A paper describes a structure:
Nonhomologous end joining is a critical mechanism that repairs DNA double-strand breaks in human cells. Nonhomologous end joining ([name]) is dependent on several canonical proteins, namely, the heterodimer [name]/80 (Ku), the large DNA-dependent protein kinase catalytic subunit (DNA-PKcs), DNA ligase IV (Lig4), x-ray repair cross-complementing protein 4 (XRCC4), and XRCC4-like factor ([name]).
We collected cryo-EM data of Ku bound to DNA and [name]. Although full-length [name] was added to the cryo-EM sample, the only density observed was that of the P-KBM, in agreement with previous studies suggesting that the P-KBM is critical for the interaction with Ku [reviewed in (11, 12)]. From the cryo-EM data, we observed no evidence for a direct interaction between the head and coiled-coil domains of [name] (residues 1 to 144) and Ku, in agreement with the previous study that reports a similar affinity of [name] or P-KBM for the Ku/DNA complex. The P-KBM is engaged in a groove located between the vWA of [name], the core of Ku, and the C-terminal arm of [name]. Patch 1 is formed between the N-terminal part of the P-KBM and a groove formed between the vWA domain of [name] and the core of Ku. Patch 2 is mediated by the C terminus of the P-KBM and two helices of [name] packed against the Ku core.
Residue numbers in the entry:
A (entry chain C): 180 to 202
B (entry chain B): 6 to 170, 181 to 544
C (entry chain A): 32 to 534
The structure:
Amino acid sequence: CPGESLINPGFKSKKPAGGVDFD
Amino acid sequence: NKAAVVLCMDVGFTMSNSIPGIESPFEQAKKVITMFVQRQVFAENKDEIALVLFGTDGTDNPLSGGDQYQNITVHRHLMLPDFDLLEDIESKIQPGSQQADFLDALIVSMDVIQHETIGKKFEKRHIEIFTDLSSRFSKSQLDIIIHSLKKCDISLQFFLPFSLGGPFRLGGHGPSFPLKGITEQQKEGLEIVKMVMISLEGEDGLDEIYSFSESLRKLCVFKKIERHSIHWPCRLTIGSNLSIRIAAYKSILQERVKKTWTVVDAKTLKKEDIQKETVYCLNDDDETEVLKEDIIQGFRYGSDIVPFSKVDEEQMKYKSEGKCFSVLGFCKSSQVQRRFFMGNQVLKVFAARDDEAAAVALSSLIHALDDLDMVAIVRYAYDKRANPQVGVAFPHIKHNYECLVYVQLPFMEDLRQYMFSSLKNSKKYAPTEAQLNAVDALIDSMSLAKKDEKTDTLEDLFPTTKIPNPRFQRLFQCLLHRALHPREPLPPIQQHIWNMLNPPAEVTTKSQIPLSKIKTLFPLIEAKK
Amino acid sequence: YSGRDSLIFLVDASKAMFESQSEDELTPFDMSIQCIQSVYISKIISSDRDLLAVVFYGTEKDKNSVNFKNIYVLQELDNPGAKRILELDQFKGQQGQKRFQDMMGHGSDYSLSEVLWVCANLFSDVQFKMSHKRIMLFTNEDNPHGNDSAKASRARTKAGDLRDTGIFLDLMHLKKPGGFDISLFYRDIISIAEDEDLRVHFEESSKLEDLLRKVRAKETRKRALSRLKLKLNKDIVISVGIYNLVQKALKPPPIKLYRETNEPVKTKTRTFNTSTGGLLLPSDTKRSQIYGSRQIILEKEETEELKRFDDPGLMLMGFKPLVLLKKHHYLRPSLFVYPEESLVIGSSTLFSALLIKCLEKEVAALCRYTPRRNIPPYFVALVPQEEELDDQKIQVTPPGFQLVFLPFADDKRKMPFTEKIMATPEQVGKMKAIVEKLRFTYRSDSFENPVLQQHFRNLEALALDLMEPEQAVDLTLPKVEAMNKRLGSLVDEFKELVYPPDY
DNA sequence: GATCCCTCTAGATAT
DNA sequence: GATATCTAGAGGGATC
């Protein structure tokens, strides 16, 4: 399954926060 | 801080006329006044309440000298309301057989305000009049009344059996007392009241003329004595060189009962004889008492436990810079979904009081956000000991004020990533065209908004946001019933409470046939357990 | 619950893993050790109620209960812990390699079928009900098992019947000297949809970066808050489930424990009379409230009864257009409503029809909400929610109704009247320029709770006896320097336009 | 029947 | 310096 976390199966992987990035 | 409210309620024989199927105006006014006094007593407010009755057989007021201001009695002077007043309202007050002028009664009540306010500090002097206006009155003191009310800074409200503008239902969302039995005397009284309200305020007093049925489902009685919340001073900082002095108030904050149910002994009814304790014992068998100071803080780390003392946790704790309201950046309003709002409060951000420069700066920010259809993502921290939050500050422009509304936004950890099966793509859960048409008819029939003709404004037929919380009124009723009749069971929920909580009878009647179609087209069967 | 999660870490102990291609990189053995350390930390933070194990093959000693050769079961399937983390940290890189070589052998022959049998029986030993059976295999060669076709075929049959059982065998492309040389044994020994790893993979790492990316979250599983009944009237009733798609994550509460022996201490609270000292039954107490000089006495059942209005569920008051739902009328976080066919049949069909028609007509179902017994009701609006799929065809917004609470009359606070001071169009334009300069794209997961992050770092440092807790970076802070550089003279111009030179 | 989660009610202590 | 928020003790549901 694409976009699936390898640590906790059944839940999508969490993208890193990043914060505020000005365009 | 403290207000002086005088309830000038009619007692005359006219309001005792009970039209079949409709509760009498005397009973409706009694219910409204009981609603007001119940909150004023059980909320422990410091406002002092006086009760003036006009239309009674007897006379007792400091204005009677023989054939003037007759049939008006001052039942209660300005003092803290109590269960004595509540019992007087419930049972000891009886309808009279005489008639009195609702303007002479206003004179008497203003006299009470003026000659009992001295020696005490009152920020507000409110007064409410409950009458049906179906009595002959002398309109010769209007100028004096208006001048005295304006000079003494005394508010006004009026409550009538009919609203200003199926079966009648007290407290419901529908037509009030029918607009066909109003006599010419009532018409003259109504136009006099309209003129008085106009002269006192301007245009918005026509909104301050209520009916008992609609006042039972509104907080309008407490409108002129409600206390405004305290402000939260801070600065709205954009970058490190642009600061705007602001003041924030809580718009929506769920109200809960302040008084707590004290646990007392079933015999002596005293909390002193009953006291709790905590017991610390080992989780294994042979529970042994553990001394209070022989326990240290700990934490779970997987299958193990680690000690983490209070002082060590304080030393290693995340330390905030302090109170702040700082903009992290601006984003489109469409990117901040309403379904992601967090927290348990809503903040409205105004400029600092008596600060024209701050007002101009905040208005410029609000107008820029509104024109660009953008919102501000801000960092909010109530104090240096408060956990910082990230939220959205979207503009809110009205005809009399402008502000930024702050609602807390979620963090990464707050979101829940749940998978739900698709409904549109489902094959076994696909409604047919007949079912879709039946649901369409149901939606059309159960509409709670009416589109006004010749105007593009939608009128709400069930504005629940103006309905007070029924739990407080139910609790007050139960407490008063127990206080007055200590040896009787609690009374049932009041019919007008149920009526304001129920949808309009027009909607209920209209929703009959479509609901039958839904029942006959949707085979709902309960699964056997 | 739907079962727990089980993971087995399979690490090769061949001599070829102990060497490094270059000298500025990290050797495969301790790099995989760091991988497992990161997985343990992530599981402890997020999903501590899972099972993790580490087994080594290609060694001299053995400790597996079923007693096969050249296989060391270092850890059994059990919950992750700081003790296990430190035990595996005992083999970390420098001097870790020497301790590994001193405590277990390396370079010895091994059998893949033997290893898979060990993994299978190790899974079978634990009695817990598990949703997933996954093993991660760490190696960077395939030569030793390619010499004997008989044992290669035996290992292939072992993978086959493990796949039939439901063992989700993963492959980790580890740092190889001259390439892993896939498509001989490890391509068809694993369970894959297709040849995604069709390249030779000269690179040392494939998914190790996201294997090392730690997960600092509570990671809660799906569970319906309440299985209520949506009542159109007294006769048409459907069953729905209530879920919280957003819930404010809390710092885990501290546990009280004995000082020197360090075991949890349970707490029991008892109420007794001061005079007699004996225990009091719940019928021996009454609830009291005092107003002024009058005391009101109620039973506990009476106090619970006065809060009772309606039976639990949702009663459909009517349908109201979405334009009448004011955005600034937020009271408490919204809930999600989804149909439940396990209670009433046809609930899904009626829910789908209602959702379709509400979305078409842009109306919200106004309902009276009673979460449970003896609780006052609130008015809620069932805002229709359409399913939203991104470019990857994964679900980001579930279909259903968004149960949004509506405030009551006394939930709203009035505010002091202010003077509506208007802003000139030039000032509005200057702030427009400022806002456009500070524009950015917002996502719901763009920020992390600094308090929770710092608490997790502190807990990890204290449990692992680190020299100092590594400080979390507060992403919820204004980048003041970047903002000033981006703005420039716009702020000064706005201040000149608005603020008089006294304020 | 235990456990975990989630509101609700109640107590305290800083800013 | 009243206040609000943070933190710390009692019940109902879901799922083992």
